[PDB]
């Protein structure tokens, strides 16, 4: 569960955590998995309050989709585990970021 607020919780089911494998391999021949993790969070479908939905949707960030879905790919760290944690922190930071700011995104 992704705790955002005390009375606001994000069920794991509403968070699509994916892992990117090296397509074309994995079933005999070329046996090494890519460290690319994938994050997809349906703001549309999730139980997020209208406030948070609007804050994210009306963001100046290009990782925001018009349908309200957070889609990223963490291919930075050596392990998908660390990229998983990155993505989760990245998501939460982004959510709070849009809330703590007034507008824009390129400004801290």
The full DSSP string for 18-67 is: EE---TT-SSSSS------EEEEEETTTS---HHHHHHHHT-S-TTB-TT
Angle between helices 80-100 and 50-57 (to 10 degrees): 100
Please name the residue that has the structure tokens 């005999």: 28
> SS3 for 99?
helix
As a whole number of angstroms, the distance between CA 94 and CA 65 comes to 14
CATH number (domain holding residue 87)? 3.30.160.20
> How many structural domains are present in the chain?
1
Domain residue limits at 11: 1-108
Please name the residue that has the structure tokens 């944690």: 85
Taking each continuous run of H as one helix and of E as one strand, the counts in the chain are: 2, 5
As a whole number of angstroms, the distance between CA 57 and CA 12 comes to 21
């Amino acid at each position: 569960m992704l705790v955002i607020s005390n009375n606001v919780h994000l069920p794991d089911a509403e968070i699509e955590l994916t892992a990117i494998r090296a397509q074309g391999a994995g079933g005999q021949n070329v046996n090494k998995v890519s460290s690319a993790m994938h994050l997809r969070f349906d703001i549309n479908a999730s139980s997020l309050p209208p406030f948070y939905k609007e804050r994210l949707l009306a963001l100046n960030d290009s990782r925001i989709t018009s349908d309200g879905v957070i889609v990223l790919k963490a291919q930075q760290y050596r392990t998908q585990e660390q990229n998983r944690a990155d993505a989760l922190l990245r998501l939460s930071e982004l959510i709070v970021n849009a809330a703590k700011l007034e507008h824009h995104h390129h400004h801290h």
